[PDB]
Amino acid sequence: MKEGIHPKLVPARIICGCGNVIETYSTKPEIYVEVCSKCHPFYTGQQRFVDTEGRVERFQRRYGDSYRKGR
Amino acid sequence: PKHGKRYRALLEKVDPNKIYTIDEAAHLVKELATAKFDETVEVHAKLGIDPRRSDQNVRGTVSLPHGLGKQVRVLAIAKGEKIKEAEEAGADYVGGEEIIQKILDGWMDFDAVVATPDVMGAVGSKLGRILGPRGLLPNPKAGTVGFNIGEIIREIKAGRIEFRNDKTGAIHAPVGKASFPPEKLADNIRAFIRALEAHKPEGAKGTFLRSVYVTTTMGPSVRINPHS
Amino acid sequence: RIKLLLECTECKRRNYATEKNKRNTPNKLELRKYCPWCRKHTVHREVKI
RNA sequence: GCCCGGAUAGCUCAGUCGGUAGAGCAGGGGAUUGAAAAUCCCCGUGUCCUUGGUUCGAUUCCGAGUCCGGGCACCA
RNA sequence: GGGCCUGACUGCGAGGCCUGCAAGCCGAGCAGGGGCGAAAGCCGGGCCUAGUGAACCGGUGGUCCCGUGUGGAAGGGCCA
RNA sequence: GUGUUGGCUCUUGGUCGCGCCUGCGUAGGAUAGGUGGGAGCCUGUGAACCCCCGCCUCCGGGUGGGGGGGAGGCGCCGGU
RNA sequence: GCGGGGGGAACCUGGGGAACUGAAACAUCUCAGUACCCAGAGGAGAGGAAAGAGAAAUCGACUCCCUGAGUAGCGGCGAG
């Protein structure tokens, strides 16, 4: 591993697709899109005591950095 | 910031920030105006209807008891005994198809026409063309046609006051005297509150009684909160 | 879609019976008759688009 | 199947936030006319699509009807 | 050719045409209910043999049967 | 669109709330925008006579103000 | 001064994860979360004391067997 989160796990899976709708509107589901993909967050940082970083990931980030900001 | 009305003092009485409530109204209005003679206060208002598609066009009358003596004249159109009953009841204009004929000619001094089913044909067809879209012709569920000419004109004196949203969705009516009786004008304002409220067609969606007020003939115009 | 369009009969709010019909000649004119299961027979009327 | 716009002079189209119907072109009439024009004046016709309600009245305001025009979405 | 009128009715049918399937097709007579004569009776579309399409899916006018504790309801079962 | 992607700011549009402050087809002392109350209203102008000044226009006029003073004006009445 | 790492026929948890063939075509669907690449704890891990069941004022950790219906049902409601 080398890109999950830092403040927990948000690094993985995704199966999905579509095709089309038109249901409780006028009929059944134009059904189909057998597709697969990724799905994730972002990066950023601050300072320990003169010289630092963070890295981490998104939200978990914001709350967190706040947290150790507390110290 | 200075304006064209001596009423200005009365206006100072007038602090338009609150919509207040009914009884308060009786008092502050009674105090507010007693100019020449004694105020002829009235209530007026507007409802979220649409009078073009007459499927909401309302009118009728509650029975604001009072004692009474002023506002909205009416023609008791019938014959002998009905002239008796309604005239005595509390009529401003009285007679029959002879009065109808006089009107066709050049005499019309009544806002609302109430005729008994005995001269109703002459009233509605002879005077139909005359009273017309003025609001002066009799209609079978517009507190304007029936045998109880006496009962309805009677309340006109003990006290009448009717209803009839005008072009843009508003009504006007007497619901208390100046130095009044005030409680009276209140009560009648009420009976109207109710019958009107009832008439309220199910075709309304939201703020129905939009504007509800008391205004006089030639005089003041202030909204009233028929709640208090 | 041609001068042949399908309508059907319904009766004074107390039922509805069916059957297709047309468009051509007297177009709209649509009273007619028929009898619902309303009461025992009854006018019906027809019309209904 | 919904969602918008229109309906006016023969043509194409203006149009009070309710009081009059108006352009532009076609068509016609005289002067001008090597001459074609351009010029130049002058006109012609209107249930303002239909049916009712609002109003003292309504091209206009609202409902409904038919039609044409636009668009947008599906279709076993 | 004229008059008057909706049965080109719902409930339905016994019993047969053809057909292996499903089809499609013929129908006296009983009921409610009317319409043409006064009536003996005809009328459950046309003078008849072609104008036709499963099943799924979904719509609308019912109905007022079902509802995943109970009241209702999304939703949904049968009719048209 | 939305998330890190913070700061000041020039501004311009739709919408609903109130004001105009506004409302002149036509007889209408008169540019009545309605529908109500509805013959009276008012004197910090001691007044509609006069003065200018603020504002909106279809000549007019409507409206809001500063002043100038010596029971006055207008709504009524009628009338269109 | 510690720990691991390195293995291991099959069983095992999670990580990622496919065409055939069926649907006598085949794009939803299907085989299936199956084959296989992986990481890893074991001697077996897995799960394991309820924001559960289920509607009786009922049960009571988790796991595996028989039954629960192949009904309840999921669906080019078709193969399945």
From Swiss-Prot, chain A:
* Record-level GO cellular component terms: ribonucleoprotein complex; ribosome
- The yes or no answer to whether the keyword Protein transport is present is no
Residues noted as binding Zn(2+) in the record, renumbered to the chain: C16, C18, C36, C39
Q: Which domain of life is it from?
A: Bacteria
Q: Which GO terms describe its molecular function?
A: metal ion binding; rRNA binding; structural constituent of ribosome
Reply yes or no: does the keyword rRNA-binding apply: yes
Q: Which UniProt keywords apply?
A: Metal-binding, Ribonucleoprotein, Ribosomal protein, RNA-binding, rRNA-binding, Zinc
Q: Which cofactor does it need?
A: Zn(2+)
Free-text comment on the cofactor: Binds 1 zinc ion per subunit.
Which PROSITE patterns does the protein's record reference? Answer: RIBOSOMAL_L31
Biological process (GO) annotations held by this record are:
translation
**Which SUPFAM superfamilies does the record cross-reference, listed alphabetically?**
L28p-like
Subunit details for this protein?
A: Part of the 50S ribosomal subunit.
Query: HAMAP family, alphabetically?
Result: Ribosomal_bL31_1
Return the similarity comment.
Answer: Belongs to the bacterial ribosomal protein bL31 family. Type A subfamily.
Q: What function does this protein fulfil?
A: Binds the 23S rRNA.
Tell me the protein's name: Large ribosomal subunit protein bL31
The species is Thermus thermophilus (strain ATCC BAA-163 / DSM 7039 / HB27)
From Swiss-Prot, chain B:
Give the coiled coil ranges: none
Q: Name one GO biological process term.
A: regulation of translation
Q: Which domain of life is it from?
A: Bacteria
Q: Name one GO molecular function term.
A: rRNA binding
Q: Does the keyword ATP-binding apply?
A: no
Q: Which GO terms describe its cellular component?
A: large ribosomal subunit
Q: Which UniProt keywords apply?
A: Repressor, Ribonucleoprotein, Ribosomal protein, RNA-binding, rRNA-binding, Translation regulation, tRNA-binding
HAMAP family (UniProt xref): Ribosomal_uL1_B
Q: How does it assemble?
A: Part of the 50S ribosomal subunit.
Q: What does this protein do?
A: Binds directly to 23S rRNA. The L1 stalk is quite mobile in the ribosome, and is involved in E site tRNA release.
Indicate the family of this protein.
Belongs to the universal ribosomal protein uL1 family.
What's the name of the protein?
Large ribosomal subunit protein uL1
Biological source species: Thermus thermophilus (strain ATCC BAA-163 / DSM 7039 / HB27)
Q: What is the lineage of its organism?
A: Bacteria, Thermotogati, Deinococcota, Deinococci, Thermales
Curated annotation (Swiss-Prot), chain C:
A molecular-function term among this protein's GO annotations: structural constituent of ribosome
Which PROSITE patterns does the entry link to?
RIBOSOMAL_L33
Recorded hits in Gene3D superfamilies, A to Z, give: Ribosomal protein L33
Identify the GO cellular component terms for this protein.
cytoplasm; ribonucleoprotein complex; ribosome
- This protein's UniProt keywords: Ribonucleoprotein, Ribosomal protein
Q: List this protein's GO terms for biological process.
A: translation
Q: Is Glycoprotein one of the keywords?
A: no
Pfam families to which the protein is assigned, alphabetical: Ribosomal_L33 (PF00471)
List, alphabetically, the InterPro entries matched.
Ribosomal_bL33, Ribosomal_bL33_CS, Ribosomal_bL33_sf, Ribosomal_zn-bd
Output the HAMAP family linked to this UniProt entry: Ribosomal_bL33
Which family does the UniProt entry place this protein in? Belongs to the bacterial ribosomal protein bL33 family.
Q: What is this protein called?
A: Large ribosomal subunit protein bL33
The organism's lineage is: Bacteria, Thermotogati, Deinococcota, Deinococci, Thermales
Encoding gene, per UniProt annotation = rpmG
